[PDB]
Amino acid sequence: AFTCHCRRSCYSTEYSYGTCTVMGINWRFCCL
Numbered sequence: 001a002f003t004c005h006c007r008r009s010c011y012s013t014e015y016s017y018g019t020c021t022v023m024g025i026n027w028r029f030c031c032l
């Protein structure tokens with residue numbers, strides 16, 4: 001499985017696969 005969170009910054013165990021927009025702002029779509 002990939003486990004993904006929308007974050008300001010991806011954690012050191014993750015990479016950025018794309019973006020989320022919520023609350024009018026961008027987040028990164030971070031998965032490990």
Ligand SMILES: [Cl-]
Pocket residue numbers: none
């Ligand atoms: Cl794969």
